[PDB]
mmCIF file of C-alpha atoms and ligand atoms in Angstrom:
data_model
loop_
_atom_site.group_PDB
_atom_site.id
_atom_site.type_symbol
_atom_site.label_atom_id
_atom_site.label_comp_id
_atom_site.label_asym_id
_atom_site.label_seq_id
_atom_site.Cartn_x
_atom_site.Cartn_y
_atom_site.Cartn_z
ATOM 1 C CA UNK A 1 -13.026 -6.040 -18.754
ATOM 2 C CA UNK A 2 -15.213 -4.480 -16.103
ATOM 3 C CA UNK A 3 -15.297 -0.678 -16.234
ATOM 4 C CA UNK A 4 -13.802 -0.365 -12.751
ATOM 5 C CA UNK A 5 -10.857 -2.405 -13.874
ATOM 6 C CA UNK A 6 -10.200 -0.314 -16.970
ATOM 7 C CA UNK A 7 -10.366 2.816 -14.845
ATOM 8 C CA UNK A 8 -7.941 1.403 -12.311
ATOM 9 C CA UNK A 9 -5.521 0.556 -15.122
ATOM 10 C CA UNK A 10 -5.851 3.962 -16.753
ATOM 11 C CA UNK A 11 -5.074 5.820 -13.558
ATOM 12 C CA UNK A 12 -2.265 3.370 -12.822
ATOM 13 C CA UNK A 13 -0.779 4.205 -16.250
ATOM 14 C CA UNK A 14 -0.692 7.907 -15.427
ATOM 15 C CA UNK A 15 0.580 7.134 -11.904
ATOM 16 C CA UNK A 16 3.641 5.550 -13.553
ATOM 17 C CA UNK A 17 4.104 8.453 -15.952
ATOM 18 C CA UNK A 18 3.927 10.841 -12.983
ATOM 19 C CA UNK A 19 6.368 8.662 -10.978
ATOM 20 C CA UNK A 20 9.043 8.784 -13.670
ATOM 21 C CA UNK A 21 8.502 12.421 -14.705
ATOM 22 C CA UNK A 22 8.578 13.657 -11.111
ATOM 23 C CA UNK A 23 12.381 13.503 -10.563
ATOM 24 C CA UNK A 24 12.991 15.042 -14.041
ATOM 25 C CA UNK A 25 10.774 17.948 -13.073
ATOM 26 C CA UNK A 26 12.405 18.262 -9.676
ATOM 27 C CA UNK A 27 15.859 18.453 -11.247
ATOM 28 C CA UNK A 28 14.682 20.990 -13.879
ATOM 29 C CA UNK A 29 13.308 23.130 -11.091
ATOM 30 C CA UNK A 30 16.416 22.964 -8.914
ATOM 31 C CA UNK A 31 14.667 21.136 -6.087
ATOM 32 C CA UNK A 32 16.836 18.117 -6.619
ATOM 33 C CA UNK A 33 20.556 18.155 -7.716
ATOM 34 C CA UNK A 34 21.218 17.298 -11.326
ATOM 35 C CA UNK A 35 22.262 13.690 -11.742
ATOM 36 C CA UNK A 36 22.720 12.708 -15.402
ATOM 37 C CA UNK A 37 22.578 8.950 -14.772
ATOM 38 C CA UNK A 38 19.448 9.162 -12.687
ATOM 39 C CA UNK A 39 18.005 11.522 -15.325
ATOM 40 C CA UNK A 40 18.671 9.162 -18.169
ATOM 41 C CA UNK A 41 17.252 6.257 -16.235
ATOM 42 C CA UNK A 42 13.916 7.982 -15.590
ATOM 43 C CA UNK A 43 13.870 9.335 -19.158
ATOM 44 C CA UNK A 44 14.340 5.886 -20.662
ATOM 45 C CA UNK A 45 11.602 4.431 -18.433
ATOM 46 C CA UNK A 46 9.297 7.186 -19.705
ATOM 47 C CA UNK A 47 10.144 6.266 -23.308
ATOM 48 C CA UNK A 48 9.072 2.641 -22.573
ATOM 49 C CA UNK A 49 5.821 3.885 -21.176
ATOM 50 C CA UNK A 50 5.039 5.843 -24.350
ATOM 51 C CA UNK A 51 5.763 2.707 -26.381
ATOM 52 C CA UNK A 52 2.963 0.863 -24.547
ATOM 53 C CA UNK A 53 -0.190 0.955 -26.609
ATOM 54 C CA UNK A 54 -2.972 2.399 -24.392
ATOM 55 C CA UNK A 55 -5.954 1.279 -26.469
ATOM 56 C CA UNK A 56 -7.363 -1.066 -23.841
ATOM 57 C CA UNK A 57 -7.240 1.804 -21.455
ATOM 58 C CA UNK A 58 -9.876 3.672 -23.423
ATOM 59 C CA UNK A 59 -12.739 1.182 -23.546
ATOM 60 C CA UNK A 60 -16.003 2.827 -24.559
ATOM 61 C CA UNK A 61 -18.358 3.582 -21.689
ATOM 62 C CA UNK A 62 -15.600 4.413 -19.204
ATOM 63 C CA UNK A 63 -15.732 8.186 -19.313
ATOM 64 C CA UNK A 64 -16.585 10.522 -16.400
ATOM 65 C CA UNK A 65 -20.148 10.622 -17.699
ATOM 66 C CA UNK A 66 -20.314 6.819 -17.237
ATOM 67 C CA UNK A 67 -18.524 5.744 -14.077
ATOM 68 C CA UNK A 68 -17.231 7.388 -10.972
ATOM 69 C CA UNK A 69 -13.658 7.549 -9.860
ATOM 70 C CA UNK A 70 -12.450 8.662 -13.292
ATOM 71 C CA UNK A 71 -11.495 12.090 -14.659
ATOM 72 C CA UNK A 72 -11.405 11.039 -18.325
ATOM 73 C CA UNK A 73 -13.735 13.320 -20.347
ATOM 74 C CA UNK A 74 -16.263 12.012 -22.837
ATOM 75 C CA UNK A 75 -14.531 14.267 -25.256
ATOM 76 C CA UNK A 76 -11.751 11.636 -25.560
ATOM 77 C CA UNK A 77 -14.147 9.378 -27.447
ATOM 78 C CA UNK A 78 -15.966 12.103 -29.402
ATOM 79 C CA UNK A 79 -12.662 13.544 -30.690
ATOM 80 C CA UNK A 80 -10.467 10.558 -31.397
ATOM 81 C CA UNK A 81 -8.389 12.617 -33.768
ATOM 82 C CA UNK A 82 -7.686 15.463 -31.327
ATOM 83 C CA UNK A 83 -6.818 12.857 -28.708
ATOM 84 C CA UNK A 84 -4.217 10.991 -30.829
ATOM 85 C CA UNK A 85 -2.684 14.367 -31.695
ATOM 86 C CA UNK A 86 -2.182 15.288 -28.017
ATOM 87 C CA UNK A 87 -0.828 11.747 -27.477
ATOM 88 C CA UNK A 88 1.596 12.123 -30.352
ATOM 89 C CA UNK A 89 2.897 15.494 -29.158
ATOM 90 C CA UNK A 90 3.610 13.857 -25.787
ATOM 91 C CA UNK A 91 5.394 10.917 -27.369
ATOM 92 C CA UNK A 92 7.637 13.234 -29.374
ATOM 93 C CA UNK A 93 8.533 15.459 -26.439
ATOM 94 C CA UNK A 94 9.491 12.392 -24.471
ATOM 95 C CA UNK A 95 11.727 11.137 -27.349
ATOM 96 C CA UNK A 96 13.656 14.425 -27.234
ATOM 97 C CA UNK A 97 13.927 14.095 -23.496
ATOM 98 C CA UNK A 98 16.369 11.217 -23.765
ATOM 99 C CA UNK A 99 19.425 12.811 -25.398
ATOM 100 C CA UNK A 100 18.863 15.979 -23.399
ATOM 101 C CA UNK A 101 18.885 14.109 -20.080
ATOM 102 C CA UNK A 102 22.653 13.678 -19.958
ATOM 103 C CA UNK A 103 23.703 16.954 -21.522
ATOM 104 C CA UNK A 104 23.325 19.311 -18.568
ATOM 105 C CA UNK A 105 20.800 20.843 -16.163
ATOM 106 C CA UNK A 106 19.916 23.713 -18.477
ATOM 107 C CA UNK A 107 19.204 21.379 -21.404
ATOM 108 C CA UNK A 108 17.264 18.861 -19.312
ATOM 109 C CA UNK A 109 15.220 21.783 -17.953
ATOM 110 C CA UNK A 110 14.355 22.947 -21.470
ATOM 111 C CA UNK A 111 13.345 19.411 -22.547
ATOM 112 C CA UNK A 112 11.333 18.876 -19.390
ATOM 113 C CA UNK A 113 9.535 22.136 -20.060
ATOM 114 C CA UNK A 114 8.342 20.859 -23.432
ATOM 115 C CA UNK A 115 7.158 17.591 -21.995
ATOM 116 C CA UNK A 116 5.351 19.455 -19.234
ATOM 117 C CA UNK A 117 3.509 21.583 -21.785
ATOM 118 C CA UNK A 118 2.283 18.338 -23.389
ATOM 119 C CA UNK A 119 0.940 17.082 -20.046
ATOM 120 C CA UNK A 120 -1.063 20.233 -19.568
ATOM 121 C CA UNK A 121 -2.256 20.599 -23.155
ATOM 122 C CA UNK A 122 -3.808 17.153 -22.910
ATOM 123 C CA UNK A 123 -5.342 17.791 -19.495
ATOM 124 C CA UNK A 124 -6.845 20.995 -20.768
ATOM 125 C CA UNK A 125 -9.094 19.392 -23.346
ATOM 126 C CA UNK A 126 -9.552 15.873 -22.024
ATOM 127 C CA UNK A 127 -9.330 15.741 -18.245
ATOM 128 C CA UNK A 128 -12.106 16.975 -15.948
ATOM 129 C CA UNK A 129 -10.941 19.780 -13.658
ATOM 130 C CA UNK A 130 -11.013 19.645 -9.785
ATOM 131 C CA UNK B 1 8.225 10.628 -4.188
ATOM 132 C CA UNK B 2 6.412 9.772 -0.979
ATOM 133 C CA UNK B 3 5.371 6.222 -0.091
ATOM 134 C CA UNK B 4 1.820 6.875 -1.190
ATOM 135 C CA UNK B 5 2.835 7.651 -4.783
ATOM 136 C CA UNK B 6 5.251 4.727 -5.012
ATOM 137 C CA UNK B 7 2.408 2.551 -3.714
ATOM 138 C CA UNK B 8 -0.142 3.815 -6.274
ATOM 139 C CA UNK B 9 2.334 3.301 -9.147
ATOM 140 C CA UNK B 10 3.220 -0.261 -8.035
ATOM 141 C CA UNK B 11 -0.435 -1.200 -7.854
ATOM 142 C CA UNK B 12 -0.956 0.643 -11.143
ATOM 143 C CA UNK B 13 1.815 -1.471 -12.782
ATOM 144 C CA UNK B 14 0.012 -4.707 -11.698
ATOM 145 C CA UNK B 15 -3.362 -3.296 -12.854
ATOM 146 C CA UNK B 16 -1.886 -2.930 -16.349
ATOM 147 C CA UNK B 17 -0.296 -6.434 -16.209
ATOM 148 C CA UNK B 18 -3.710 -7.790 -15.176
ATOM 149 C CA UNK B 19 -5.595 -5.794 -17.867
ATOM 150 C CA UNK B 20 -3.513 -7.350 -20.639
ATOM 151 C CA UNK B 21 -3.278 -10.828 -19.207
ATOM 152 C CA UNK B 22 -7.048 -10.968 -18.656
ATOM 153 C CA UNK B 23 -8.214 -11.543 -22.250
ATOM 154 C CA UNK B 24 -5.350 -14.025 -22.760
ATOM 155 C CA UNK B 25 -6.575 -16.078 -19.790
ATOM 156 C CA UNK B 26 -10.194 -15.929 -20.876
ATOM 157 C CA UNK B 27 -9.269 -17.135 -24.381
ATOM 158 C CA UNK B 28 -7.225 -19.969 -22.884
ATOM 159 C CA UNK B 29 -10.171 -20.944 -20.710
ATOM 160 C CA UNK B 30 -12.518 -20.926 -23.685
ATOM 161 C CA UNK B 31 -14.527 -18.129 -22.118
ATOM 162 C CA UNK B 32 -13.952 -15.848 -25.026
ATOM 163 C CA UNK B 33 -13.430 -16.953 -28.617
ATOM 164 C CA UNK B 34 -9.828 -17.336 -29.790
ATOM 165 C CA UNK B 35 -8.783 -14.302 -31.850
ATOM 166 C CA UNK B 36 -5.162 -14.539 -32.988
ATOM 167 C CA UNK B 37 -4.789 -10.782 -33.717
ATOM 168 C CA UNK B 38 -6.133 -9.723 -30.351
ATOM 169 C CA UNK B 39 -4.051 -12.394 -28.663
ATOM 170 C CA UNK B 40 -0.981 -11.110 -30.400
ATOM 171 C CA UNK B 41 -1.804 -7.551 -29.437
ATOM 172 C CA UNK B 42 -2.262 -8.249 -25.715
ATOM 173 C CA UNK B 43 0.846 -10.455 -25.641
ATOM 174 C CA UNK B 44 3.018 -7.726 -27.180
ATOM 175 C CA UNK B 45 1.807 -5.074 -24.676
ATOM 176 C CA UNK B 46 2.737 -7.555 -21.913
ATOM 177 C CA UNK B 47 6.192 -7.854 -23.378
ATOM 178 C CA UNK B 48 6.512 -4.057 -23.263
ATOM 179 C CA UNK B 49 5.463 -4.080 -19.584
ATOM 180 C CA UNK B 50 8.147 -6.641 -18.686
ATOM 181 C CA UNK B 51 10.679 -4.228 -20.310
ATOM 182 C CA UNK B 52 9.782 -1.385 -18.011
ATOM 183 C CA UNK B 53 12.392 -1.364 -15.289
ATOM 184 C CA UNK B 54 10.436 -1.527 -12.080
ATOM 185 C CA UNK B 55 13.213 -0.412 -9.694
ATOM 186 C CA UNK B 56 11.427 2.786 -8.578
ATOM 187 C CA UNK B 57 8.357 0.758 -7.667
ATOM 188 C CA UNK B 58 10.303 -0.981 -4.889
ATOM 189 C CA UNK B 59 11.551 1.955 -2.824
ATOM 190 C CA UNK B 60 12.736 0.887 0.640
ATOM 191 C CA UNK B 61 10.206 1.445 3.412
ATOM 192 C CA UNK B 62 7.103 0.789 1.238
ATOM 193 C CA UNK B 63 6.232 -2.704 2.304
ATOM 194 C CA UNK B 64 3.020 -3.696 4.111
ATOM 195 C CA UNK B 65 4.923 -3.442 7.401
ATOM 196 C CA UNK B 66 5.476 0.254 6.614
ATOM 197 C CA UNK B 67 2.453 1.777 4.936
ATOM 198 C CA UNK B 68 -1.194 0.970 4.586
ATOM 199 C CA UNK B 69 -2.784 0.211 1.207
ATOM 200 C CA UNK B 70 0.101 -2.052 0.101
ATOM 201 C CA UNK B 71 0.133 -5.904 -0.245
ATOM 202 C CA UNK B 72 3.848 -6.083 -0.967
ATOM 203 C CA UNK B 73 5.534 -8.169 1.752
ATOM 204 C CA UNK B 74 8.684 -7.059 3.547
ATOM 205 C CA UNK B 75 10.009 -10.317 2.145
ATOM 206 C CA UNK B 76 10.536 -8.613 -1.176
ATOM 207 C CA UNK B 77 13.349 -6.563 0.375
ATOM 208 C CA UNK B 78 14.584 -9.307 2.740
ATOM 209 C CA UNK B 79 14.986 -11.857 -0.022
ATOM 210 C CA UNK B 80 16.044 -9.630 -2.961
ATOM 211 C CA UNK B 81 17.693 -12.640 -4.645
ATOM 212 C CA UNK B 82 14.581 -14.785 -4.586
ATOM 213 C CA UNK B 83 12.369 -11.849 -5.673
ATOM 214 C CA UNK B 84 14.568 -11.238 -8.716
ATOM 215 C CA UNK B 85 14.309 -14.912 -9.454
ATOM 216 C CA UNK B 86 10.508 -14.885 -9.464
ATOM 217 C CA UNK B 87 10.662 -11.727 -11.704
ATOM 218 C CA UNK B 88 12.861 -13.350 -14.314
ATOM 219 C CA UNK B 89 10.646 -16.469 -14.399
ATOM 220 C CA UNK B 90 7.767 -14.116 -15.289
ATOM 221 C CA UNK B 91 9.884 -12.198 -17.827
ATOM 222 C CA UNK B 92 10.889 -15.376 -19.612
ATOM 223 C CA UNK B 93 7.456 -16.874 -19.658
ATOM 224 C CA UNK B 94 6.081 -13.712 -21.130
ATOM 225 C CA UNK B 95 8.752 -13.721 -23.863
ATOM 226 C CA UNK B 96 7.650 -17.244 -24.874
ATOM 227 C CA UNK B 97 3.980 -16.295 -25.083
ATOM 228 C CA UNK B 98 4.469 -13.827 -27.896
ATOM 229 C CA UNK B 99 5.028 -16.269 -30.815
ATOM 230 C CA UNK B 100 2.569 -18.775 -29.341
ATOM 231 C CA UNK B 101 -0.176 -16.201 -28.980
ATOM 232 C CA UNK B 102 -1.017 -16.320 -32.664
ATOM 233 C CA UNK B 103 -0.202 -20.014 -33.302
ATOM 234 C CA UNK B 104 -3.565 -21.385 -32.126
ATOM 235 C CA UNK B 105 -5.841 -21.879 -29.112
ATOM 236 C CA UNK B 106 -4.003 -24.919 -27.637
ATOM 237 C CA UNK B 107 -0.593 -23.296 -28.065
ATOM 238 C CA UNK B 108 -1.938 -20.077 -26.505
ATOM 239 C CA UNK B 109 -3.449 -22.015 -23.602
ATOM 240 C CA UNK B 110 -0.279 -23.875 -22.854
ATOM 241 C CA UNK B 111 1.742 -20.649 -22.903
ATOM 242 C CA UNK B 112 -0.787 -18.748 -20.810
ATOM 243 C CA UNK B 113 -0.623 -21.661 -18.364
ATOM 244 C CA UNK B 114 3.104 -21.104 -17.997
ATOM 245 C CA UNK B 115 2.661 -17.369 -17.409
ATOM 246 C CA UNK B 116 -0.175 -17.978 -14.921
ATOM 247 C CA UNK B 117 2.149 -20.251 -12.859
ATOM 248 C CA UNK B 118 4.611 -17.347 -12.647
ATOM 249 C CA UNK B 119 1.994 -14.922 -11.383
ATOM 250 C CA UNK B 120 0.988 -17.206 -8.605
ATOM 251 C CA UNK B 121 4.525 -18.338 -7.708
ATOM 252 C CA UNK B 122 5.481 -14.716 -6.967
ATOM 253 C CA UNK B 123 2.213 -14.007 -5.132
ATOM 254 C CA UNK B 124 2.615 -17.102 -2.917
ATOM 255 C CA UNK B 125 5.899 -15.795 -1.481
ATOM 256 C CA UNK B 126 5.733 -12.034 -1.780
ATOM 257 C CA UNK B 127 2.168 -10.847 -1.757
ATOM 258 C CA UNK B 128 0.126 -10.524 1.373
ATOM 259 C CA UNK B 129 -2.746 -12.994 1.429
ATOM 260 C CA UNK B 130 -5.331 -10.229 1.604
HETATM 261 C C1 HEC C 201 -3.341 12.878 -23.005
HETATM 262 C C2 HEC C 201 -2.979 12.164 -24.196
HETATM 263 C C3 HEC C 201 -2.590 12.999 -21.813
HETATM 264 C C4 HEC C 201 -1.213 13.252 -21.698
HETATM 265 C C5 HEC C 201 -0.228 13.585 -22.854
HETATM 266 C C6 HEC C 201 -0.942 13.351 -20.338
HETATM 267 N N1 HEC C 201 -2.032 13.028 -19.630
HETATM 268 FE FE1 HEC C 201 -2.258 13.076 -17.555
HETATM 269 N N2 HEC C 201 -4.356 12.179 -17.756
HETATM 270 C C7 HEC C 201 -4.893 12.154 -18.909
HETATM 271 C C8 HEC C 201 -6.197 11.742 -18.615
HETATM 272 C C9 HEC C 201 -7.324 11.542 -19.598
HETATM 273 C C10 HEC C 201 -6.250 11.563 -17.233
HETATM 274 C C11 HEC C 201 -7.462 11.081 -16.390
HETATM 275 C C12 HEC C 201 -7.405 9.568 -16.091
HETATM 276 C C13 HEC C 201 -8.619 9.010 -15.335
HETATM 277 O O1 HEC C 201 -9.229 8.077 -15.825
HETATM 278 O O2 HEC C 201 -9.089 9.689 -14.443
HETATM 279 C C14 HEC C 201 -4.962 11.840 -16.743
HETATM 280 C C15 HEC C 201 -4.586 11.812 -15.380
HETATM 281 C C16 HEC C 201 -3.300 12.111 -14.826
HETATM 282 C C17 HEC C 201 -2.992 12.090 -13.485
HETATM 283 C C18 HEC C 201 -3.889 11.497 -12.393
HETATM 284 C C19 HEC C 201 -3.763 10.023 -12.190
HETATM 285 C C20 HEC C 201 -4.584 9.494 -10.990
HETATM 286 O O3 HEC C 201 -4.050 8.883 -10.052
HETATM 287 O O4 HEC C 201 -5.824 9.528 -11.000
HETATM 288 C C21 HEC C 201 -1.625 12.441 -13.379
HETATM 289 C C22 HEC C 201 -0.791 12.535 -12.122
HETATM 290 C C23 HEC C 201 -1.230 12.739 -14.676
HETATM 291 N N3 HEC C 201 -2.261 12.574 -15.443
HETATM 292 C C24 HEC C 201 0.038 13.223 -15.007
HETATM 293 C C25 HEC C 201 0.601 13.453 -16.277
HETATM 294 C C26 HEC C 201 1.907 13.903 -16.541
HETATM 295 C C27 HEC C 201 2.941 14.160 -15.461
HETATM 296 C C28 HEC C 201 1.999 14.002 -17.925
HETATM 297 C C29 HEC C 201 3.119 14.356 -18.696
HETATM 298 C C30 HEC C 201 4.447 13.866 -18.452
HETATM 299 C C31 HEC C 201 0.759 13.619 -18.440
HETATM 300 N N4 HEC C 201 -0.111 13.317 -17.544
HETATM 301 C C32 HEC C 201 0.332 13.604 -19.755
HETATM 302 C C33 HEC C 201 -4.416 12.488 -20.155
HETATM 303 C C34 HEC C 201 -3.102 12.812 -20.535
HETATM 304 C C1 HEC C 202 6.458 -10.815 -8.611
HETATM 305 C C2 HEC C 202 7.728 -10.892 -9.281
HETATM 306 C C3 HEC C 202 5.182 -10.737 -9.205
HETATM 307 C C4 HEC C 202 4.821 -11.126 -10.513
HETATM 308 C C5 HEC C 202 5.636 -12.119 -11.384
HETATM 309 C C6 HEC C 202 3.430 -11.013 -10.566
HETATM 310 N N1 HEC C 202 3.016 -10.291 -9.525
HETATM 311 FE FE1 HEC C 202 1.074 -9.586 -9.140
HETATM 312 N N2 HEC C 202 1.802 -8.396 -7.397
HETATM 313 C C7 HEC C 202 2.992 -8.611 -6.930
HETATM 314 C C8 HEC C 202 3.055 -7.834 -5.773
HETATM 315 C C9 HEC C 202 4.230 -7.684 -4.841
HETATM 316 C C10 HEC C 202 1.809 -7.234 -5.645
HETATM 317 C C11 HEC C 202 1.339 -6.241 -4.541
HETATM 318 C C12 HEC C 202 1.494 -4.773 -5.012
HETATM 319 C C13 HEC C 202 1.102 -3.747 -3.938
HETATM 320 O O1 HEC C 202 1.891 -2.868 -3.674
HETATM 321 O O2 HEC C 202 0.086 -3.968 -3.309
HETATM 322 C C14 HEC C 202 1.049 -7.608 -6.771
HETATM 323 C C15 HEC C 202 -0.291 -7.207 -7.018
HETATM 324 C C16 HEC C 202 -1.137 -7.645 -8.079
HETATM 325 C C17 HEC C 202 -2.461 -7.330 -8.259
HETATM 326 C C18 HEC C 202 -3.255 -6.261 -7.493
HETATM 327 C C19 HEC C 202 -3.081 -4.884 -8.046
HETATM 328 C C20 HEC C 202 -3.859 -3.777 -7.302
HETATM 329 O O3 HEC C 202 -4.581 -2.985 -7.929
HETATM 330 O O4 HEC C 202 -3.750 -3.566 -6.093
HETATM 331 C C21 HEC C 202 -2.917 -7.972 -9.441
HETATM 332 C C22 HEC C 202 -4.279 -7.864 -10.069
HETATM 333 C C23 HEC C 202 -1.827 -8.695 -9.863
HETATM 334 N N3 HEC C 202 -0.831 -8.499 -9.045
HETATM 335 C C24 HEC C 202 -1.811 -9.506 -11.016
HETATM 336 C C25 HEC C 202 -0.761 -10.228 -11.595
HETATM 337 C C26 HEC C 202 -0.845 -11.037 -12.744
HETATM 338 C C27 HEC C 202 -2.120 -11.227 -13.541
HETATM 339 C C28 HEC C 202 0.418 -11.598 -12.917
HETATM 340 C C29 HEC C 202 0.825 -12.477 -13.943
HETATM 341 C C30 HEC C 202 0.527 -12.298 -15.332
HETATM 342 C C31 HEC C 202 1.246 -11.107 -11.909
HETATM 343 N N4 HEC C 202 0.476 -10.290 -11.122
HETATM 344 C C32 HEC C 202 2.579 -11.373 -11.653
HETATM 345 C C33 HEC C 202 4.018 -9.392 -7.430
HETATM 346 C C34 HEC C 202 4.084 -10.099 -8.638
#
């Protein structure tokens, strides 16, 4: 598709991830009361998102070196193996997030912490900083 | 969280739907060669998107009457029954595209036609003509 379109989709993808992770983080932090049903609901939605195959999102020539409006580093394409590894770590942390969701604030907080680490670890090597 | 993030995720969700439907429509139009594997791949991602529960995308007070940058009509919330109806029509049509996607160009075109009808049916009633 056109580069602009791929970029819009890629950012949209992370917008959804952020939308569903947001209330889990809020609850882990104590900003928002713990609600096990709400927690499980967001958690399961996040699992669906990780099931989606994001290949089309990473069309060659759509890095920050190529088009504006994106924060995806060229590194993503030069290190396909490091990228799938950070993706896999995320997918696994999210899987663990499900059972934890309904077992208490302290457990959800622990699980959320692991997921959060995966967000950052990816950003660190593959997202431009500003 | 705030309207602006709900708005970006909703638009993001449709950007992904469009990204995956795009190659299916081009193949059906004869604008790109029929490739059964690729068709199957895009179809299956579309199925995964229809599984994502979109409830959080439709937070009250996020229609075009409320915030700028959205094309979602207040009608979505006024006619929740009819909206759900349009959504299911889309869900079902997408479910029928999967097996057809790799059965041939004519089969794929017919099925993509059905899906296409659902996109526009929902847009006619619930999306601002912008
Ligand atoms: C790598 C495999 C990543 C994982 C795991 C996470 N994110 Fe990330 N993200 C990644 C990239 C390459 C980008 C840039 C996208 C672009 O093209 O610019 C992002 C971006 C985001 C953003 C910004 C979205 C926007 O509107 O522009 C958010 C809010 C975001 N990411 C959040 C996020 C969270 C909450 C994660 C864990 C639950 C997470 N990401 C993981 C790469 C990767
Ligand atoms: C209702 C049940 C819909 C279905 C079925 C389809 N779409 Fe739609 N779409 C709908 C709404 C309410 C909106 C507005 C969202 C907003 O908040 O503005 C949209 C928007 C789009 C867009 C624009 C996305 C953007 O970046 O702003 C596209 C490209 C789009 N929709 C495509 C699309 C396709 C290809 C569909 C069928 C396969 C389809 N949509 C179905 C509502 C509904």
